[PDB]
């Protein structure tokens, strides 16, 4: 497949505030969590991930394998557990993350040096791309 490792920095990020308002995060940490300009560190073997999302404020730290599903727990950001299963897709990685919100998931992948994510709950879509420091 691809490989995904890299410190990846944020250049765009579209809809943000809409896709944590589908969450039920509340108007205070949605005001903070949209200037915030969160970093992916992913560092990959294989099957094996570790994506570290990360800001000044709080990390979130997923650790998998692609195709088996885990419990997630989505401490800080809405506190949340879902059975989620991370599964390549030709060269994305397509995340399904069962629970309570309907739709919620995720899709990563690279176009050229960029790296390309989008973030989906009940039919609203957040856009983020990055590009690593050269
Ligand atoms: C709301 C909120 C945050 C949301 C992070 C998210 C939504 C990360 C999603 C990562 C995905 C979908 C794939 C790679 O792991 C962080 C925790 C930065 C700071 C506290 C506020
Ligand atoms: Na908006």
Same mark, same amino acid.
């Not at 944020?10 to 969450?23: D, I, Q, S």
């Not at 990390?59 to 599903?69: A, L, P, S």
């Given at each position: 497949?691809?490989?995904?490792?890299?410190?990846?920095?944020?250049? /765009?990020?579209?809809? &943000? %505030? #809409?896709? @944590?308002?589908?969450? !039920?995060?509340?108007?205070?940490?949605?005001?903070?969590?949209?200037?915030?300009?969160?970093?992916?560190?992913?560092?990959?073997?294989?099957?094996?991930?570790?994506?570290?999302?990360?800001?000044?404020?709080?990390?979130?730290?997923?650790?998998?394998? /692609?195709?088996?599903? &885990? %419990? #997630?727990? @989505?401490?800080?950001? !809405?506190?949340?557990?879902?059975?989620?299963?991370?599964?390549?897709?030709?060269?994305?990685?397509?995340?399904?993350?069962?629970?309570?919100?309907?739709?919620?998931?995720?899709?990563?992948?690279?176009?050229?040096?960029?790296?390309?994510?989008?973030?989906?709950?009940?039919?609203?879509?957040?856009?983020?791309?990055?590009?690593?420091?050269?």
């Amino acid at each position: 497949p691809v490989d995904f490792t890299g410190y990846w920095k944020m250049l /765009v990020n579209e809809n &943000f %505030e #809409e896709y @944590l308002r589908a969450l !039920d995060v509340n108007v205070a940490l949605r005001k903070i969590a949209n200037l915030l300009k969160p970093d992916l560190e992913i560092v990959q073997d294989g099957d094996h991930m570790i994506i570290r999302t990360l800001s000044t404020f709080r990390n979130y730290i997923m650790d998998f394998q /692609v195709g088996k599903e &885990f %419990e #997630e727990d @989505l401490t800080g950001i !809405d506190d949340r557990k879902c059975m989620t299963t991370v599964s390549w897709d030709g060269d994305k990685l397509q995340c399904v993350q069962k629970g309570e919100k309907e739709g919620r998931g995720w899709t990563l992948w690279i176009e050229g040096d960029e790296l390309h994510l989008e973030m989906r709950v009940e039919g609203v879509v957040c856009k983020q791309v990055f590009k690593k420091v050269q």
